[PDB]
Design a protein around this nucleic acid. Structure first.
Ligand code: PRO
Lengths: 26, 48, 110, 117, 103
RNA sequence: GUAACGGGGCUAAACCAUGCACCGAAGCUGCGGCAGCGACGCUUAUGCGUUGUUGGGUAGGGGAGCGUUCUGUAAGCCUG
RNA sequence: CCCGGCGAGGGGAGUGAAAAAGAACCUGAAACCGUGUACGUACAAGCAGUGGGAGCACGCUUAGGCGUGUGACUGCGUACC
């Protein structure tokens, strides 16, 4: 019978953005 | 006259400094360079 | 005399099995069996099988007379965990654990 | 040439954690917290070695005052009379007498009152 | 019967057949020790003095053993000033056994 | 939320004047122990005595040490 | 040989110097998670300790009293870099 194996993957680190207005903008 | 009975002259084998090895040694945390500045950086200094 | 039966690498979390173990700690085997018979839980089946195995061991190998046996000890440990992957939204990934457990039962005429 | 830090570090950590027995929670299980706990305990011990003497002297004085007022005189006048009579017994012994001997203390009060008057 | 005397800058209250711990004394282990001064003697009636040091009272005792006390730890520390220090200590003492209190 | 004596409470437990007591610190004194620097003796050299005095500490300067792994002393010594 | 689904897992027997060397196999620490015994805890307010301190349990001891564990109540006390 077969033995168990694990794998893994990492993301690309997608460039998310804060789409709401700035905290203390101009 | 035995290989384990010789000894050097007194006051001839000073140890040498070792920087950054705790509080008790008196040279930990910046080992004598003071605080921030140009002279405390790696490779820092000025010309002759 | 002490008789021991164990079930290692049981497919269940230890916390869920521990809820059933304390139901029978210290009872006589005769009432422990039918206590376990009428609880609607998955772990009850496993604990019942272990208990029956312990009774059979205590009858065959060593002396007889299961009419005066008691559950002296019972406890649940943690076995190794298997690790898997579950995808989430926006390209993220998460880690899943599948926990196991070890089940031990000790019976004694005394 | 190459030195491994395996054994010395374990010895140091065990030594620190041994003297943190009986502390609550993670303060007796985790090295980073136990180290601070032990240091603070050391400082407290150093300070209380001084506070102990003050606490005991204050207790002795409070205990002498009650017996003195029982015999009909206040603490200040009592020890002023004792000083005028040139009696050198200290406060610890005086409190001990006041508890365990009601007659010798009365005799001392008599002497102090006689000298003061 | 009990008496009061001072030995090492401190005062004590003892009775016959009792052991006491004092400061270190430069006295051999076997032989006895004298205490000329006595501040008070009490048994039924109190031979207590106005002027210190009751006139004809002495206390008889002999040395039992020398030794050192238990260890204590001294710790000095200063918040976020990069300074700390440690030190240990043990204190010598002497044990005597009271043998006779004479009025 | 009392909220402009720390409270309780106070017609003296408030204020002015005089006086005598006592409490009160890691300050001073008493007892025991450690170390640094001088002066004077002996060893007349290491050293051993008599004393006087000093010992909070960051940046930083000076002086003494503990422990770890390798080489000699090692065909030695310890160890079923 | 026995329980179990002609399972997985165990309990005996046997080999071996050793199976707590059983193939997930030399030794086998820490974080982390449990079972058992002693003491404390349901009118009590805060960096969780430190100084004082009853009571209880266990061991020794010729009383005397010590040693270990716990710790009611109480003075002081706002982590580290
Ligand atoms: O006005 C405008 C910006 C927002 C932050 C403070 N001043």
């Amino acid at each position: 019978v077969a033995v168990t194996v694990y794998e893994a993957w990492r993301q690309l680190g997608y460039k998310g953005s804060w789409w709401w207005p700035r905290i203390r903008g101009p | 006259m035995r290989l384990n009975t010789l000894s050097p002259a007194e006051g001839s084998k000073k140890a040498g400094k070792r920087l950054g090895r705790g509080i008790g040694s008196g040279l930990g945390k910046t080992g004598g360079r003071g605080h921030k500045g140009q002279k405390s950086r790696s490779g820092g200094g000025v010309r002759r | 005399m002490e008789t021991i039966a164990k079930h290692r690498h049981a497919r269940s979390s230890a916390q869920k099995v521990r809820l059933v173990a304390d139901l029978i700690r210290g009872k006589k085997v005769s009432q422990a069996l039918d206590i376990l018979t009428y609880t609607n839980k998955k772990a009850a089946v496993l604990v019942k099988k272990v208990l029956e195995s312990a009774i059979a061991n205590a009858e065959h190998n060593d002396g007889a007379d299961i009419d005066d046996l008691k559950v002296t000890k019972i406890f649940v440990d943690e076995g190794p965990s298997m690790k898997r992957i579950m995808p989430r939204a926006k390209g993220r990934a998460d880690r899943i654990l599948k926990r196991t457990s070890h089940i031990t039962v000790v019976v004694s005429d005394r | 040439a190459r030195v491994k830090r395996g054994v010395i570090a374990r010895a140091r950590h065990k030594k620190i954690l041994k003297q943190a027995k009986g502390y609550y929670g993670a303060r007796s299980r985790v090295y980073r917290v136990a180290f601070q706990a032990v240091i603070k305990a050391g400082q407290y011990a150093y300070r209380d070695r001084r506070q102990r003497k003050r606490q005991f002297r204050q207790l002795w004085i409070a205990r002498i005052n009650a017996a003195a007022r029982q015999n009909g005189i206040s603490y200040s006048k009592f020890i002023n009379g004792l000083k005028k009579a040139s009696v050198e017994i200290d406060r610890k012994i005086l409190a001990d007498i006041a508890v365990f001997d009601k007659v010798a203390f009365t005799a001392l009060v008599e002497k102090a009152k006689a000298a003061l008057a | 019967m009990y008496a009061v005397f001072q030995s090492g800058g401190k005062q004590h209250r003892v009775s016959e057949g009792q052991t006491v711990r004092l400061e270190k004394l430069d006295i051999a282990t076997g032989e006895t020790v004298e205490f000329a001064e006595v501040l008070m003697i009490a048994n039924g009636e109190e031979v207590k003095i106005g002027v210190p040091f009751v006139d004809g009272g002495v206390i008889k005792a002999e040395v039992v053993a020398h030794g050192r006390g238990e260890k204590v730890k001294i710790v000095k520390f200063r918040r976020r000033k990069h300074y700390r220090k440690q030190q240990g200590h043990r204190q010598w003492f002497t044990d005597v056994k009271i043998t006779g209190i004479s009025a």
